[PDB]
Amino acid sequence: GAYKYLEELQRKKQSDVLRFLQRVRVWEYRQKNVIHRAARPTRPDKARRLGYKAKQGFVIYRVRVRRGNRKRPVPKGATYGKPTNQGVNELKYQRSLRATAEERVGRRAANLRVLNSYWVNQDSTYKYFEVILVDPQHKAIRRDARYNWICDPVHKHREARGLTATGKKSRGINKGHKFNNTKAGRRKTWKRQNTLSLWRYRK
Amino acid sequence: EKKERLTKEAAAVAEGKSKQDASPKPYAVKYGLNHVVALIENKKAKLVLIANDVDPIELVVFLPALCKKMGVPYAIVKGKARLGTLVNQKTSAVAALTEVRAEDEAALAKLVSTIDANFADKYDEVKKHWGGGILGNKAQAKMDKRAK
Amino acid sequence: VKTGIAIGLNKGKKVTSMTPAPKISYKKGAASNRTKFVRSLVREIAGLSPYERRLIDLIRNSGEKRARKVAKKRLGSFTRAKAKVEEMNNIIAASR
Amino acid sequence: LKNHFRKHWQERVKVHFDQAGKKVSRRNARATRAAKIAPRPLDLLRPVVRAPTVKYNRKVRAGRGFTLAEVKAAGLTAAYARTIGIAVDHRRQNRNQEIFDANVQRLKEYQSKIIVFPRNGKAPEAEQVLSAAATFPIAQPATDVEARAVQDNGESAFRTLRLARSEKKFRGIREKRAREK
Amino acid sequence: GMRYFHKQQAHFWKPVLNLDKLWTLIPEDKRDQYLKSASKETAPVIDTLAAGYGKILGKGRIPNVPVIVKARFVSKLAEEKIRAAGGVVELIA
RNA sequence: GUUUGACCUCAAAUCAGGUAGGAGUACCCGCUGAACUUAAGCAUAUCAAUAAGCGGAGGAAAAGAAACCAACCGGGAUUGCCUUAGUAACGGCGAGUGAAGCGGCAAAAGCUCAAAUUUGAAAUCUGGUACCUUCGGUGCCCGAGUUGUAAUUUGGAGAGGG
RNA sequence: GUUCUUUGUAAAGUGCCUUCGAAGAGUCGAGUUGUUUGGGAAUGCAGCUCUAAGUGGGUGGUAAAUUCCAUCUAAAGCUAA
């Protein structure tokens, strides 16, 4: 197999061959549009392990996202409140750029469902992701029971609701004493324990 | 050909007296990338051809070093469509051959010697010696005139 | 082995024993022949990263202590710096 | 002296008028499940396990599922057990022969008591029992007899505990001393 | 005072049982026969942990009957008072 | 051969067939985000990880079969209730804030990919078309696909050879 | 229940020996900034920079170094009450 070599080689990012390929491909992607259909994955091993299958109804979209912090769009940087808010160019946007890219791509392609995404390249100004999408109207995927679950309607805009891996991470959904405030839903636990339960026969 | 082989197999084996003697031992080229990389590391391959033009070149950058290490005669061929032609695909990105008829054994051996002498023994140094320091013609003229 | 009291070096009530089985999600990450071969070949292809090139110079000039420090800073931790410096020592002792 | 009512608590108030109706619907759901599941119990056989947490290790308690070692020792497989009505837990491990033998005898009793119908046909009527938990209750093991002969040796358990404490406390010092030797 | 991060009140579970009671743990049916039969060759064993008691204390007098007490922890005076009657204290975990 | 073709990439069509938008939004998943008030006045703080604002679904949603809890003689996906507990802890150590393991209970359900040569036979799949017993089946023909579609394997294991 | 079809000598389960046993990277993790939390020499998240390993890695509620131990196996996914 060659996917193993591809994995171990893509791990060596600061070697000469990979930084050359990076320097070329970033220029190519920057000359192309911000969102554009990719004929095939730049990284077949990554796509393969994330759930891509080279058959009809599986789609790859390359997407570009601006880098840096979040700026609040108040006029003239004034917030009109207490001074303790913070400097305005220092806000961080709890959702990741990968999620932003996934959601923009899913908005362009609304008939598709966003399965996953992965980093390909980056610059000072831009980050570059390849997004894997699925067509649930295609019969090859309506059949083929390994992927017929994406066709049910509870998987609409997974990326917008935070069900992809980056979404689960940004929500902080894992098991442990560390993820106690956000394990079943931050707001769910808050609503659960800031709630006065009163029984018929009062305790 | 597969269809006629299958109907002949059903006719000979289901009713007649034989198990796999109907269709003889086949000889053919191996063309899958993973399959060929697995044929290497078992050292069944006598020849490998590697397309020069591949999208993700990282699919094939490791293959020459691997063939060298396992002791295989490799060659880098111009054209993946040229391989797809001989294997009934649009592209193949590799091609291999691990066994032959005796009529072609000698031609294969002579071809491997030719490939070694002309490709590797000529280009064994190429693991060093970077390429790609070329300039445009305008810049070249500028450099020439500034030099002289 | 237990003592049969509520305190001490080995506290707790004595049960007989069992050694149930060795689980297979305990030998995870262990080096296979395929992983060894692939990783050796990929090192032969890709070569060295810049901080590794610095480390091989600094072990020859400056000693292993500066290497451990700068590797602890370029990487995260001392535990990883030790193994990186051991790797570079082996690369040097092999190529030399 | 500390009453947490500075927020808008009046929005988030749950009063359990639905207690009785929920009980009724729960009973009806159990009945419907029984009809749908008719010959079978509604409960899988669970093993016996010893609780953690010194406060509770004295007690034995019902667990999630039997181990694969227990199942193989009983002499049937995990999938067939899951079809037969036995819970299996792949991550529980066996370090106690008492618990092992207890759950093995539990599985043996279950196998002897049940009656399996063939896939093809007959299906003789069997008059369902609803509770394998009641049919195979958990038994607290018996530590010792009621009465016994006294035997005294004169080491006074107080002093024994004190010496255990002291050796635990001064282990490392003596080890470092013998190292310096 | 000092702090304790991740305190959990199961490390500290250690309820106490003075010597005065010590026969409530024996049922009533059995109590009066064991009292009259002050047999050293056959005395009633009392498991305090199963009753839900970690340590034994010595607030008061028991009769001079033998008894086998099984407990994780004891006091010096409790062991003394039981040994006076001629009862051993077996340690458990 | 300054010809004839194959591939790759990018386009066009009132091309064949489908698909998204908007509404509602009690509950649900995220994002963004105040002040009144309470603290003496008040920057920390509290009101509040609230209201308003934005995106997105369903009959439930989310979560979910451990990179868990533990330190026990060890338990054993997730969710909710009783309790843990107004406690450990946080805080101009002030106003105030504030969980979690254990235990009892309700309900109970387990599993799937990538990474492995079918290599003595891409065994896989969409569409078009003719029949049929039409939530689909059989045959035939273009095509997808070896930059990897099927079977087999998922760590509890498992595979190959015997 | 009553026929229609026995599909198949096709798939699956099981014992002993032998050689193996691949397991997810701008990711884990670390530094800093902002935010958040009961989380306290820093609970989670995001932005910028740095960036791994394979008897390895994460966690073990006081920050480090050294020697051990215990327990799970991330960076991919589905699922009723």
Side-chain angles (χ1 to χ4, degrees):
Chain A
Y3 293 120
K4 198 72 165 188
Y5 298 86
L6 258 59
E7 187 209 308
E8 198 66 32
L9 192 78
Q10 199 69 24
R11 286 176 175 198
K12 309 298 185 213
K13 289 187 161 59
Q14 259 172 319
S15 71
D16 302 5
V17 71
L18 256 65
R19 61 213 315 278
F20 173 80
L21 292 166
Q22 167 266 341
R23 222 142 77 76
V24 168
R25 293 179 179 155
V26 79
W27 169 88
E28 190 180 32
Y29 305 158
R30 197 160 42 219
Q31 295 317 289
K32 295 190 168 216
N33 311 51
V34 161
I35 293 155
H36 64 87
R37 172 73 183 279
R40 54 187 69 257
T42 311
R43 285 169 73 181
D45 58 300
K46 190 75 171 162
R48 188 126 174 98
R49 65 176 104 266
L50 289 176
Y52 164 84
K53 232 79 172 196
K55 68 190 207 156
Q56 294 158 325
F58 272 94
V59 192
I60 305 285
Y61 258 67
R62 217 163 278 136
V63 55
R64 207 162 79 203
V65 173
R66 286 247 170 173
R67 265 182 112 174
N69 297 347
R70 209 186 82 78
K71 188 154 171 197
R72 210 200 290 193
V74 296
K76 310 181 220 213
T79 300
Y80 284 98
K82 293 185 238 285
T84 194
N85 293 119
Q86 193 49 269
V88 168
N89 311 65
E90 301 182 300
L91 276 36
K92 306 288 170 187
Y93 186 43
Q94 300 306 325
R95 270 209 280 241
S96 51
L97 306 174
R98 211 169 137 195
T100 315
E102 274 174 6
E103 185 28 44
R104 290 184 182 158
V105 171
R107 281 213 300 281
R108 181 69 88 80
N111 59 305
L112 291 325
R113 308 297 178 73
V114 172
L115 181 50
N116 231 301
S117 54
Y118 56 87
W119 178 99
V120 282
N121 211 329
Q122 69 185 41
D123 205 342
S124 162
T125 303
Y126 290 119
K127 270 195 190 153
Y128 302 83
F129 304 94
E130 251 161 22
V131 201
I132 309 170
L133 303 117
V134 194
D135 194 19
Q137 332 301 338
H138 206 279
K139 294 280 155 195
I141 282 140
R142 279 173 99 70
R143 306 160 195 161
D144 194 60
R146 295 208 177 75
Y147 305 94
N148 63 351
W149 51 267
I150 199 95
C151 311
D152 313 48
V154 285
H155 292 99
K156 291 190 203 157
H157 284 233
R158 296 169 78 233
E159 68 281 10
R161 287 186 286 154
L163 313 181
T164 59
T166 174
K168 294 194 115 169
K169 198 195 180 299
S170 311
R171 294 153 73 204
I173 276 160
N174 275 283
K175 304 186 177 159
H177 68 275
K178 293 173 136 63
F179 311 94
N180 275 336
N181 275 321
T182 166
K183 218 200 301 203
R186 189 195 97 210
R187 284 168 248 253
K188 207 201 193 201
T189 67
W190 186 88
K191 196 166 172 279
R192 189 226 302 155
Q193 67 206 12
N194 308 59
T195 300
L196 196 71
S197 211
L198 299 182
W199 297 88
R200 294 187 309 163
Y201 306 94
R202 301 285 154 104
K203 322 212 83 177
Chain B
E1 291 137 69
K2 181 149 172 128
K3 195 149 163 282
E4 84 91 42
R5 185 179 114 262
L6 286 194
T7 197
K8 187 252 171 143
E9 170 169 0
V13 173
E15 302 85 343
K17 307 73 40 182
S18 35
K19 310 312 301 187
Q20 59 172 340
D21 313 352
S23 320
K25 178 66 164 46
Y27 297 82
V29 300
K30 323 306 208 182
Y31 51 111
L33 186 119
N34 301 343
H35 177 224
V36 165
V37 171
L39 280 152
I40 312 151
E41 315 171 359
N42 312 146
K43 310 185 150 115
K44 286 158 162 189
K46 310 305 188 68
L47 242 193
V48 195
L49 312 170
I50 301 148
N52 63 325
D53 53 334
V54 175
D55 173 28
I57 194 74
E58 70 215 56
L59 277 160
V60 287
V61 294
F62 62 86
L63 260 159
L66 202 140
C67 282
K68 181 93 174 196
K69 209 185 180 73
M70 309 308 292
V72 173
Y74 72 100
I76 297 174
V77 170
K78 236 181 200 200
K80 55 172 186 240
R82 205 146 142 63
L83 302 168
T85 63
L86 55 68
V87 84
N88 295 298
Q89 298 301 332
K90 297 186 277 169
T91 72
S92 184
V94 302
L97 191 43
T98 171
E99 62 197 41
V100 278
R101 290 174 254 266
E103 59 184 33
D104 296 319
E105 276 179 24
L108 167 50
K110 202 74 69 157
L111 189 65
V112 160
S113 309
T114 311
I115 275 154
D116 283 335
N118 288 335
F119 193 85
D121 291 82
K122 282 226 294 179
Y123 311 146
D124 271 338
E125 42 69 62
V126 76
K127 286 77 167 177
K128 55 173 78 70
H129 300 336
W130 296 50
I134 304 138
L135 316 105
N137 72 329
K138 277 165 165 171
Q140 251 299 335
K142 270 177 71 164
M143 210 174 73
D144 289 6
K145 285 191 85 90
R146 170 152 45 69
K148 71 103 194 169
Chain C
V1 176
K2 297 274 183 272
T3 52
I5 49 165
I7 36 179
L9 296 164
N10 310 308
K11 55 166 132 175
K13 131 82 168 163
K14 303 166 103 90
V15 304
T16 69
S17 43
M18 312 181 77
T19 62
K23 293 226 269 167
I24 314 93
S25 64
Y26 282 164
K27 299 214 306 318
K28 174 151 186 182
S32 86
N33 308 316
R34 214 193 184 270
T35 59
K36 285 176 177 90
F37 183 67
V38 170
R39 291 169 176 158
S40 307
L41 202 137
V42 169
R43 286 287 297 193
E44 270 166 14
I45 290 159
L48 296 166
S49 160
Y51 77 97
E52 297 166 324
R53 293 189 168 113
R54 273 197 294 284
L55 253 66
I56 57 170
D57 189 299
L58 261 43
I59 282 149
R60 293 173 143 158
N61 305 22
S62 317
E64 289 83 333
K65 223 196 181 55
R66 305 233 175 288
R68 272 147 177 259
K69 203 175 94 163
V70 70
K72 188 191 182 298
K73 196 165 189 313
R74 217 55 53 228
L75 316 160
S77 52
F78 205 57
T79 67
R80 298 178 178 195
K82 289 216 215 92
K84 182 56 62 173
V85 168
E86 206 72 36
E87 189 188 282
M88 292 289 130
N89 290 358
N90 305 322
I91 293 297
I92 276 150
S95 182
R96 190 266 310 203
Chain D
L1 313 93
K2 308 180 82 188
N3 280 301
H4 288 45
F5 296 99
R6 284 202 45 185
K7 296 172 182 167
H8 295 272
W9 64 277
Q10 273 184 128
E11 302 187 43
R12 299 172 289 282
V13 193
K14 180 123 192 70
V15 201
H16 296 274
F17 312 114
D18 42 320
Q19 191 173 23
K22 279 175 117 65
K23 194 182 173 188
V24 173
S25 40
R26 251 180 267 121
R27 289 191 103 216
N28 291 354
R30 286 198 274 276
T32 293
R33 197 171 129 87
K36 186 227 188 79
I37 298 288
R40 314 191 259 114
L42 303 174
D43 76 323
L44 316 179
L45 188 73
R46 308 287 174 168
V48 75
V49 307
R50 200 163 281 283
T53 300
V54 168
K55 186 176 177 174
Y56 289 116
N57 60 355
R58 39 160 178 153
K59 309 201 291 142
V60 86
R61 182 253 286 169
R64 184 180 184 76
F66 293 80
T67 56
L68 318 186
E70 280 163 16
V71 165
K72 188 165 228 177
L76 85 175
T77 53
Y80 185 66
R82 284 193 179 96
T83 67
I84 283 283
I86 293 152
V88 195
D89 197 7
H90 65 84
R91 22 192 161 65
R92 203 179 112 247
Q93 287 278 332
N94 275 121
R95 267 170 181 74
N96 197 348
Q97 204 81 29
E98 285 85 322
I99 297 284
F100 184 86
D101 296 324
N103 279 306
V104 168
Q105 267 291 306
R106 221 174 155 69
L107 292 154
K108 220 73 66 52
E109 292 168 359
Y110 187 78
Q111 267 148 280
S112 56
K113 297 272 187 80
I114 62 170
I115 169 158
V116 187
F117 305 160
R119 305 194 185 167
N120 324 282
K122 294 42 61 173
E125 296 302 352
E127 318 105 0
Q128 92 179 223
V129 189
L130 283 155
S131 196
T135 303
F136 304 96
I138 296 297
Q140 296 284 319
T143 69
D144 208 314
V145 290
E146 193 178 296
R148 204 214 302 159
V150 70
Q151 297 289 11
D152 188 88
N153 308 339
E155 280 80 355
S156 210
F158 184 85
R159 164 143 275 266
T160 316
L161 295 165
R162 280 282 208 167
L163 293 164
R165 194 117 55 206
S166 71
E167 64 177 14
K168 191 209 175 280
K169 176 167 171 57
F170 301 108
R171 182 104 190 289
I173 290 163
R174 302 176 195 183
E175 293 172 322
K176 199 218 284 178
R177 292 214 198 91
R179 277 179 69 269
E180 291 293 337
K181 261 54 147 163
Chain E
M2 69 153 100
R3 291 182 283 178
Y4 198 131
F5 306 147
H6 196 40
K7 179 78 148 285
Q8 37 184 348
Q9 311 296 348
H11 301 352
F12 284 69
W13 181 84
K14 190 188 241 161
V16 284
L17 184 68
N18 293 292
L19 272 175
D20 54 1
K21 300 276 166 54
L22 202 67
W23 297 76
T24 60
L25 314 197
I26 295 151
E28 299 93 330
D29 45 25
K30 295 289 188 298
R31 212 173 294 168
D32 308 331
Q33 56 165 12
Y34 279 115
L35 257 301
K36 273 86 187 186
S37 62
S39 34
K40 184 192 220 299
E41 311 269 298
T42 290
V45 53
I46 311 188
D47 197 344
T48 68
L49 189 68
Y53 288 114
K55 195 168 190 188
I56 315 300
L57 305 182
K59 190 180 155 170
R61 309 230 172 86
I62 44 160
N64 201 100
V65 197
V67 51
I68 292 156
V69 194
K70 295 205 303 213
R72 284 171 174 170
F73 294 105
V74 278
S75 35
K76 197 203 202 324
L77 182 60
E79 194 148 30
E80 286 166 12
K81 267 163 177 181
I82 303 155
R83 285 178 86 78
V88 74
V89 171
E90 305 213 293
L91 288 167
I92 58 180

